[PDB]
């Protein structure tokens, strides 16, 4: 049916005038990647671009970015035409001009620095009316092709002349500002943005379809997460990516007035949003307007809450307006809003990961210069507890750390700082490290849900438990139907019992890494904090988080800590029950199987654990983790030493055979002790070398050699002196007795 | 001054605040200083009057607006960071925090030198002992 047109989609290749399509549609269009092609669009405009093809992209989707869409007057989900352009011409002088308020506060011969490297080796197929863009020196500026010596579209010759003159002019109301955001301006929220896009793409791009069928769309959405995460940014990006009218409301602006003005402003806001349908309304600091009635005393506060409720109820009957609200936690606000018709739909943003932090750094490092030393992988690893704004601030701070004293003094007298010297400055990693160590007000200490990185290779041996573990977790999700054919119902809990330091904590994350599922870990100190604080309600919240992060895995360690606290193993007079495990059982029993939330417990004293948590249902399966054996100890040593540089005179099998009744940590400590010895030897040798020849005034004396880049059997055999057993044999006998009496 | 705002009525107080902000903007590059910030914006649990909560929102709106206009900088002084609302400690209002702590023997000696300039002293001062005993 005329596969001439095609759908729009995001663009991977950031270079302008470039595209990416699927592999097969080559003869469907009869052209190559190098072939240049014109592409159509409304207001009777078409732009030329070079071609390229990928595979992941479907055969029905074009890949293109914000600027090309702007110079084509298009959004995502739309459709355009296409036609190859073998009739291109090599274009001589094609007059351009920088057209923006970006000009404001600029100087220097921007022409050369900005353009010559861009058009360099480009052959950029350019057609008049284009608004192409370039970024440099902490700024990003755009130019428009006003004239093309040959027309309409032409190749650029590396030889073609650019007599570049002209003064800034205005952007017609047709096209939008460069500053306007988009999906490409956010990172680390890929899952949430997909949900929102799929949820609210039909009512705005297809309202007549909704009128054509009987179905109830959502007319209210809630987003919760810590501040500085990008909620208003997401809302504005969604509004800009659809063309729907956008309107904003601020909580304090309403509370900073009297009753009449406040409850008139709210009504006028809703009326304007209705009149400008399709439209979107955004509310922030909702807790400042509508907290729970217990915290409100003023009558006017209840009046405004009631006004909000009445307006939300009245929305349903009229227009296509959608409402979005932002809060910190779901429980902070009234429960009357979380009903069927006001704020039914809810969303979490959580925190970005190392990948998300890296993406944010890339976003905020576009205009800024950089050096080779800088790498955004290590920085992302050392930026735990940082969300959004923080990173941005860091970036800025780092930049200033380079400018302040050197550039100020130099420019104070030499000349009025111009663009050339202003942008000549680069950025250095030492500056990033300074901005990180000095300014590290990490703004977060709450729990983190994310996929771990530990892999089976990290763990040593223990193959049989791996097989026993994949069956309990993988098979349900990979093959749910098999269980229906038979009468089985998968279990939801497992318990690990054994001596400490045997990798019990590592499996819970290896499983998640294999299955690519979220993981949450709660340590014993938190359980004791809740016990002493007598706050068992928090338990519920945890599960809710897991409920919203499914499929996921839950971990509990030191589960015997409470029993150990009150009296010894036997305990005080009291029995084996307490206030927290009761709540855990209450939550576990009232949980659905289809949510796919597995539960893992871990301990080393199963004798005193409450039997009630091991009855059929709950935590029925039990697994024993034994001490590593010779063949396992060699694997543990190799895994621990696959990160540090080592010599070859070592005999790892010899050490492993020498060790009996040792734990996994008992070898990591040996590795760390040997590494410390090597560091100390290197430090002493280097300091002595530097100190000795300073007295001898030899201008050049460099016998530069790494004194000890790698360690030998000497340091290790020294470390074995302190290396000794940790777990008593009696404990192993107790474990075996418990494992046999079953 | 905090009390000077609390010693008036709503209209006068929330007119003086705005007028001060406009005056600071007009004379840019300028600086605004606020003291006794706790007297104005403590945590809501300690606030009961509706006017008290109507005087904090105005400040938040002004702080949000500041980012868009002019070169004005704002500095505030408090006894302890936790004594005030947590909504001010955000990105765009009061991101930067600093501590003054307490001077040491060297600082006390320096303060004595500052305060003893125009005064006539004998040869028995030995301010080091006073700083140690201070
Ligand atoms: N995921 C993100 N990607 C890029 N920038 C972000 C992200 N999250 C937050 N920011 C930064 O935070 C600032 C906006 O904060 P905002 O989202 O308004 O805070 P809140 O989440 O409390 O509403 C922006 O300047 C933006 O650079
Ligand atoms: N099988 C193993 N392979 C490699 N390292 C291990 C192994 N078991 C324990 N470790 C080491 O012990 C540490 C984790 O201790 P862990 O076993 O989680 O204690 P616990 O059993 O109390 O949870 C890690 O630093 C890891 O290097």
Swiss-Prot record, chain A:
Catalytic activity: ATP + H2O = ADP + phosphate + H(+)
Modified residues (N6,N6,N6-trimethyllysine): 295
InterPro entries: AAA+_ATPase, AAA_ATPase_CDC48, AAA_ATPase_domain, AAA_lid_3, Asp_de-COase-like_dom_sf, ATPase_AAA_core, ATPase_AAA_CS, Cdc48_dom2
Binding site for ATP 2: 501-506
Protein's cellular compartments: Cytoplasm, Cytosol; Endoplasmic reticulum; Nucleus; Cytoplasm, Stress granule
Modifications after synthesis and translation: Phosphorylated by tyrosine kinases in response to T-cell antigen receptor activation. Phosphorylated in mitotic cells.
CC per GO annotation: ATPase complex; azurophil granule lumen; ciliary basal body; cytoplasm; cytoplasmic stress granule; cytosol; Derlin-1 retrotranslocation complex; endoplasmic reticulum
GO biological process, one term: interstrand cross-link repair
Keyword vocabulary terms for this entry: Acetylation, Amyotrophic lateral sclerosis, ATP-binding, Autophagy, Charcot-Marie-Tooth disease, Cytoplasm, Disease variant, DNA damage, DNA repair, Endoplasmic reticulum, Hydrolase, Isopeptide bond, Lipid-binding, Methylation, Neurodegeneration, Neuropathy, Nucleotide-binding, Nucleus, Phosphoprotein, Transport, Ubl conjugation, Ubl conjugation pathway
Keyword DNA repair part of the UniProt annotation: yes
Consequence when changing residue 75 to G: In IBMPFD1; cultured cells expressing the mutant protein show a marked general increase in the level of ubiquitin-conjugated proteins and impaired protein degradation through the endoplasmic reticulum-associated degradation (ERAD) pathway; shows strongly reduced affinity for ADP and increased affinity for ATP; abolishes enhancement of K-295 methylation by ASPSCR1; decreased interaction with CAV1 and UBXN6
Modified residues (N6-succinyllysine): 648
Binding site for ATP 1: 227-233, 328, 364
Region Disordered, annotated ranges: 688-707
UniProt domain comment: The PIM (PUB-interaction motif) motif mediates interaction with the PUB domain of RNF31.
Self-association state and partner proteins as the record states: Homohexamer. Forms a ring-shaped particle of 12.5 nm diameter, that displays 6-fold radial symmetry. Part of a ternary complex containing STX5A, NSFL1C and VCP. NSFL1C forms a homotrimer that binds to one end of a VCP homohexamer. The complex binds to membranes enriched in phosphatidylethanolamine-containing lipids and promotes Golgi membrane fusion. Binds to a heterodimer of NPLOC4 and UFD1, binding to this heterodimer inhibits Golgi-membrane fusion. Interaction with VCIP135 leads to dissociation of the complex via ATP hydrolysis by VCP.
Disorder noted: Inclusion body myopathy with early-onset Paget disease with or without frontotemporal dementia 1: An autosomal dominant disease characterized by disabling muscle weakness clinically resembling to limb girdle muscular dystrophy, osteolytic bone lesions consistent with Paget disease, and premature frontotemporal dementia. Clinical features show incomplete penetrance.
Function of the protein: Necessary for the fragmentation of Golgi stacks during mitosis and for their reassembly after mitosis. Involved in the formation of the transitional endoplasmic reticulum (tER). The transfer of membranes from the endoplasmic reticulum to the Golgi apparatus occurs via 50-70 nm transition vesicles which derive from part-rough, part-smooth transitional elements of the endoplasmic reticulum (tER). Vesicle budding from the tER is an ATP-dependent process.
UniProt-recorded name of the protein: Transitional endoplasmic reticulum ATPase
Organism: Homo sapiens
């Amino acid at each position: 049916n005329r596969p001439n047109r095609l759908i729009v989609d995001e663009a991977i290749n950031e270079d302008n005038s470039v595209v990416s399509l699927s592999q097969p549609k080559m003869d469907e269009l009869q052209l190559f990647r190098g072939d240049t092609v014109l592409l159509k669009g409304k207001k009777r405009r078409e732009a030329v671009c070079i071609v390229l093809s990928d595979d992941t992209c479907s055969d029905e989707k074009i890949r293109m970015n914000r600027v090309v869409r702007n110079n084509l007057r298009v959004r995502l989900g739309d459709v355009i035409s296409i036609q190859p352009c073998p009739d291109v011409k090599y274009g001589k002088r094609i007059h351009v001009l920088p057209i923006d308020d970006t000009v404001e506060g600029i100087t220097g011969n921007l022409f050369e620095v900005y353009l010559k490297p861009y058009f360099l080796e480009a052959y950029r197929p350019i057609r008049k009316g284009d608004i192409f863009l370039v970024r440099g020196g902490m700024r990003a500026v755009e130019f428009k092709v006003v004239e093309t010596d040959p027309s309409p579209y032409c190749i650029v010759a590396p030889d073609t002349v650019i007599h570049c003159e002209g003064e800034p002019i205005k952007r017609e109301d047709e096209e939008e500002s460069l500053n306007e955001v988009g999906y490409d301006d956010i990172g680390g929220c890929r899952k949430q943005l997909a949900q929102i896009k799929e949820m609210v793409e039909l009512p705005l791009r297809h309202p007549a379809l909704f009128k054509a069928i009987g179905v109830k769309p959502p007319r209210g959405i809630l987003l919760y997460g810590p501040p500085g995460t990008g909620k208003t940014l997401i809302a504005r990006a969604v509004a800009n990516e659809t063309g729907a009218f956008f309107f904003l409301i601020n909580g304090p602006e309403i509370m900073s007035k009297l009753a009449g003005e406040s409850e008139s402003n709210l009504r006028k806001a809703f009326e304007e949003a209705e009149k400008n349908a399709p439209a979107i309304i955004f509310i922030d600091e909702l807790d400042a307007i509508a907290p729970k009635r217990e915290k409100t005393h003023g009558e006017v506060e209840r009046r405004i809450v009631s006004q909000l409720l009445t307006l939300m109820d009245g929305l349903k009957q009229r227009a296509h307006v959608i409402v979005m609200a932002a809060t910190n936690r779901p429980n902070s606000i009234d429960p009357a809003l979380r009903r069927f018709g006001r704020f039914d739909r809810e969303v979490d943003i959580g925190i970005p990961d190392a990948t998300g932090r890296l993406e944010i750094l890339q976003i905020h490092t576009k205009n800024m210069k950089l050096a080779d030393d800088v790498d955004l992988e290590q920085v992302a690893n050392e930026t735990h507890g940082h969300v959004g704004a923080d990173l941005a601030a860091l970036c800025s701070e780092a930049a200033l750390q380079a400018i302040r004293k050197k550039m100020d003094l130099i420019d104070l007298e030499d000349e009025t700082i111009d663009a050339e010297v202003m942008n000549s400055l680069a950025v250095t990693m030492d500056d990033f490290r300074w901005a990180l160590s000095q300014s590290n007000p990490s703004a977060l200490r709450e729990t983190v849900v994310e996929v771990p990185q530990v892999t089976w290779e990290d763990i040593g041996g223990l193959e049989d438990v791996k097989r026993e573990l994949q069956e309990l977790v993988q098979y349900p999700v990979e093959h749910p139907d098999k269980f229906l054919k038979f009468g089985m119902t998968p279990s939801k809990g497992v318990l690990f019992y054994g001596p400490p330091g045997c990798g019990k904590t590592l499996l819970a994350k290896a499983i998640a890494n294999e299955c690519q599922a979220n993981a949450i870990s709660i340590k014993g100190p938190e359980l004791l904090t809740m016990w002493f604080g007598e706050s068992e309600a928090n338990v519920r919240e945890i599960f809710d988080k897991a409920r919203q992060a499914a499929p996921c895995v839950l971990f509990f360690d030191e589960l015997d800590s409470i029993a150990k606290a009150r009296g010894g193993n036997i305990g005080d007079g009291g029995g084996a029950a307490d206030r927290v495990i009761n709540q855990i059982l209450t939550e576990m029993d009232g949980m659905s199987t289809k949510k796919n939330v597995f539960i893992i417990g871990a301990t080393n004293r199963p004798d005193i654990i409450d039997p009630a948590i091991l009855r059929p249902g709950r935590l029925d399966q039990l697994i024993y983790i034994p001490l590593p054996d010779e063949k396992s100890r060699v694997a543990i040593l190799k895994a621990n030493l696959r990160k540090s540089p080592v010599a070859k005179d070592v005999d790892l099998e010899f050490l492993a055979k020498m060790t009996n009744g040792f734990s996994g940590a008992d070898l990591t400590e040996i590795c760390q002790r040997a590494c410390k010895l090597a560091i100390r030897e290197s430090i002493e040798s280097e300091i002595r070398r530097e100190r000795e020849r300073q007295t001898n005034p030899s201008a050049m004396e460099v016998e530069e050699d790494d004194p000890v880049p790698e360690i030998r059997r000497d340091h290790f055999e020294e470390a074995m002196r302190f290396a000794r057993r940790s777990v008593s044999d009696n404990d192993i006998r107790k474990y075996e007795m418990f494992a046999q009496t079953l």
